[PDB]
Design a protein around this ligand. Structure first.
Ligand SMILES: CCN1c2cc([N+](=O)[O-])ccc2N(C)C(=O)c2cccnc21
Lengths: 519, 406
């Protein structure tokens, strides 16, 4: 095991000891096959013949498959091998990029000598009178817990120097693949490409040559990648007259994949089909709306669209639109509508809400993801006026902040359909709600509904009071519950009640709602 | 090095790192490269599974950036160290804060403990593994650091201490609280001298950066906000209800409060705007209730054995209300904060509040923040400037409790 690579010291989970699992003898066909391989490996230094002084052993079988599962169960946790995956729009444009498959992958990195003994395995001897050969890996065993992370690690240090000597160049390590692009006249590129291979090769690392490499575009992690443009790997929307819950979910799934680049995809209608379904194999006939939606999506998908890459020079701009109740879309471009990316947001945070609250939340998610991709926040272009925003702002008991943003007059404009009077209305009837109401003008109505929550009863009362009152109305209640909800001023809710109420509210000229402790 | 161990049985933290802005990232890079150079920290390998979050914050009145590691989790799993907070400090006229964190960079860290100080510098869009290091010296923000350095610290301070014992010097984490009663001018003076005494006696082995715009806190003037009732000219049904409500609530705290009389004034189904004449009877009940609130409820004491809590409330307009108690309804303090944007405000308030908690009880409280996590997480580092990090939680206050403050 002669190598220029400093090894990462490994140790087994505390208390735990090496794996002492039995070897299930093999036919002589299998035995020979191993020996031959094991010997080649010995020759290469990857493993080394050891004595029966090693009390450890992992099973092996037949190519060679060493099962390290157990060891893996006894080996320390390493640091998360690559956390999140980079998104295509977060990249910079390249005159060219080449991909290198890393051969001799793990089978090319030294293993902490101190830890090798644990990798010990034995190949039975044909003759039964005789004992078998005991080896132990000298390198990162394929299939072992550390292998990945450790290799990943090593790899980058190997790259470390070269990188500095070629600041222009850019390399990204991803598994057993090495991605490299530059803005060098083509050949210069290929040239550097060669230097690279050699440099690696200088630490026993082999790689494929020009004619063997795959070439752009590059389908990776589900996308299609060119040095200067990107997109989602092609989506074919099956054609059939029998959709199964299963079929549906998949399609919807696929449909979403698109949304990040394809603007206007809508799943509302398809999704709806899944209600009350009883089996993955249950067949739901498409509704008229479903057909329409699918068809429409068929058309969008039909024409290939493609995302552009990041130019750290120019700014990031994000534009938002409400494409439906609790449904929003957005797009990030730097150069006018030259999208880097697009996307939707249907996140209903809380049982009740309003566009202002949501739109605000949308912004956040965007902000979060922008940072995660371009390390910066985009200036926003929103369909809401500052005045509207600020109004809601101050009112809300919760804190919140929206980075720099400009109003965009692109209907529909988000607004507040109503607003409670800050002071009780003079000359307006006053309803006292507790299952009914009693007003100062002598009126009353007491309804008793079947099947209802205490909280739901409260809302209904109020509801009644709204119905039976004139355009201006004062309402007194003892439900902190109902109060908070309304005070929040929702314009959409899961509960129909609230919606009915909301409907009433929107109509009224003025509405004062108040609380008073009960009993 | 002094051997230190986690509390029995606990393991090191493996917290996840929050995405950062290219800008903030670059900062930490520069910083760490230097720290590395000087052997303070060193890159670590994958054989290290631990990780604490790290942030970049700005030094106000400075061009330089500051690294802030979130040792909160670590500190919790860090064995206790089996100076009692000075009751005098809170009482002093003026207190200034110094950032004596760099002093820690001198003492070595028990090698066996370093691995746990693992933290990482994120990489944009996960396009690269991300720089990982661990500390070799005592790290700023770690519970252990001030303890271990306590020694050298008491020493280096002994002279000045007895030189002019008219001043109270308190250390909390990387913070040094200096209290005096001197004239604002003489203060800032003797203050600068300590800075120098510190440099001039090298714990920096640069003069001690001030914290809080160098500005001073006047704990002397920290007064509690009593509950208040509207002083209406004419009382409308509505006003009264709102009055009774508030009172009912406060009755929880002050048992002597009574509304029987005020509640009578609200007979039947009257109309909200109808103005009701206070009756001699009720008039003296309010008055009494009013007198009862004039001061904090008796019998509320600080139990060092319990966590200090702190909830803040938004009153809109840039004003905020907050309370510190260890038991429901049994506040030890209450105040307010006025104006920027919501977050900025909030973080300022939190820090302000924490800073007091520290000055009063030499301990940080556990805040209850009225905001959405993702939002906080996103911007707090943008205005944060303290060197410690309080423990927080996220809540959705009921617009009822807000109406009962300010
Ligand atoms: C230059 C590297 N490269 C690229 C980078 C990357 N990353 O950083 O995680 C992932 C994939 C990837 N691939 C495969 C590319 O083809 C590519 C295209 C354009 C620019 N850089 C591209």
């Amino acid at each position: 095991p002669i190598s220029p690579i400093e090894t990462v010291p490994v140790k087994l989970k505390p208390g735990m000891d090496g794996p002492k699992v039995k070897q299930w003898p093999l036919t002589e066909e299998k035995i020979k096959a191993l020996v031959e391989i094991c010997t080649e490996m010995e020759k290469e230094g990857k493993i080394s013949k050891i004595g029966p002084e090693n009390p450890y052993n992992t099973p092996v079988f037949a190519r060679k498959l060493v099962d390290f599962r157990e060891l893996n169960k006894r080996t320390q946790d390493f640091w998360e091998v690559q956390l999140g995956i980079p998104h295509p729009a977060g990249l910079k444009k390249k005159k060219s990029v080449t991909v290198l498959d890393v051969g001799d992958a793990y089978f090319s990195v030294p293993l902490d000598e101190d830890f090798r003994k644990y990798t010990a395995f034995t190949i039975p001897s044909i003759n039964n009178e005789t004992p078998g050969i005991r080896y132990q890996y000298n390198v990162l065993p394929q299939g072992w817990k550390g292998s990945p992370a450790i290799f990943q690690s090593s790899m980058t240090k190997i790259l470390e120097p070269f990188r500095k000597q070629n600041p222009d160049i850019v390399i990204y390590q991803y598994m057993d693949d090495l991605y490299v692009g530059s803005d060098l006249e083509i050949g210069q590129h290929r040239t550097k490409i060669e230097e690279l291979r050699q440099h690696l090769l200088r630490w026993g690392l082999y790689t494929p040559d020009k004619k063997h490499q795959k070439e752009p575009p590059f389908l990776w992690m589900g996308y299609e990648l060119h040095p200067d443009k990107w997109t989602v790997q092609p989506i074919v929307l099956p054609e059939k007259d029998s959709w199964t819950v299963n079929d549906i979910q998949k399609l919807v799934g696929k449909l979403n994949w698109a949304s990040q680049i394809y603007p206007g995809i809508k799943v509302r209608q398809l999704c709806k089909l899944l209600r009350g379904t009883k089996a993955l194999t249950e067949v739901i006939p498409l509704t008229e709306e479903a057909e329409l939606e699918l068809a429409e999506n068929r058309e969008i998908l039909k024409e290939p669209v493609h995302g552009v890459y990041y130019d750290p020079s120019k700014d990031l701009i994000a534009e938002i639109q409400k494409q439906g109740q609790g449904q929003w879309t957005y797009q990030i471009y730097q150069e006018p509508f030259k999208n880097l990316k697009t996307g939707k947001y249907a996140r209903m945070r809380g049982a009740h809400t309003n566009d202002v609250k949501q739109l605000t939340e949308a912004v956040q998610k965007i902000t979060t993801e922008s940072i995660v991709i371009w390390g910066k926040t985009p200036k926003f272009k929103l369909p809401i006026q500052k005045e509207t925003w600020e109004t809601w702002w101050t009112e809300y008991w919760q804190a919140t902040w929206i980075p720099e943003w400009e109003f965009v007059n692109t209907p529909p404009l988000v607004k507040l359909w109503y607003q409670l009077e800050k002071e009780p209305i003079v000359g307006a009837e006053t309803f006292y709600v507790d299952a009914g109401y009693v007003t100062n003008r002598g009126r009353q109505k007491v309804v008793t509904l079947t099947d209802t929550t205490n909280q739901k009863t409260e809302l209904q009362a109020i509801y009644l009071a709204l119905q039976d009152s004139g355009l201006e109305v004062n309402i007194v209640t003892d439900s902190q519950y109902a109060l908070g909800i309304i005070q929040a001023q929702p314009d959409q809710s899961e509960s129909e009640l609230v919606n009915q109420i909301i409907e009433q509210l929107i109509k009224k000229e003025k509405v004062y709602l108040a609380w008073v402790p009960a009993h | 090095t002094v051997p230190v161990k986690l509390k029995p049985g606990m393991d090191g933290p493996k917290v996840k790192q929050w995405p950062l802005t290219e800008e903030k990232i670059k900062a930490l890079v520069e910083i760490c490269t230097e720290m590395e150079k000087e052997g303070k920290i060193s890159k670590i390998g994958p054989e290290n599974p631990y990780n604490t979050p790290v942030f970049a914050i700005k030094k106000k009145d400075s061009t330089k950036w500051r690294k802030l590691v979130d040792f909160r989790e670590l500190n919790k799993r860090t064995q206790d160290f089996w100076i009692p907070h000075p009751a005098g400090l809170k009482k002093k006229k003026s207190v200034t804060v110094l950032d004596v964190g760099d002093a820690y960079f001198s003492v070595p860290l028990d090698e066996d403990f370093r691995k746990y100080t693992a933290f990482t510098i994120p990489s944009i869009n996960n396009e690269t593994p991300g720089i990982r290091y661990q500390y070799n010296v005592l790290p700023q923000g770690w519970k252990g650091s001030p303890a271990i350095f306590q020694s050298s610290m008491t020493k280096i301070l002994e002279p000045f201490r007895k030189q002019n014992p008219d001043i109270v010097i308190y250390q909390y984490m990387d913070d040094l609280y200096v209290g005096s009663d001197l004239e604002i001018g003489q203060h800032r003076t003797k203050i600068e001298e300590l800075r120098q005494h510190l440099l001039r006696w090298g714990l920096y082995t640069k003069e001690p950066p001030f914290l809080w715009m160098g500005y001073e806190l006047h704990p002397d003037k920290w007064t509690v906000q009593p509950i208040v009732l509207p002083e209406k000219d004419s009382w409308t049904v509505n006003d009264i209800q709102k009055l009774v409500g508030k009172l009912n609530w406060a009755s929880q705290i002050y048992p002597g409060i009574k509304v029987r009389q005020l509640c009578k004034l609200l007979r039947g189904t009257k109309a909200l705007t109808e103005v009701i004449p206070l009756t001699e009877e009720a008039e003296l009940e309010l008055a009494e209730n009013r007198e009862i609130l004039k001061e904090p409820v008796h019998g509320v004491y600080y139990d060092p054995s319990k966590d200090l809590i702190a909830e803040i409330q938004k009153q809109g307009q840039g004003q905020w209300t907050y309370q510190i108690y260890q038991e429901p309804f049994k506040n030890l303090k209450t105040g307010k904060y006025a104006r920027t944007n919501d977050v900025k405000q909030l973080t300022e308030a939190v820090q302000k509040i924490t800073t007091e908690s520290i000055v009063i009880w030499g301990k940080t409280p556990k805040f209850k923040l009225p905001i959405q996590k993702e939002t906080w997480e996103t911007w707090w580092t943008e205005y944060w400037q303290a060197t410690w990090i309080p423990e927080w939680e996220f809540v959705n206050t009921p617009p009822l409790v807000k109406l009962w403050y300010q």
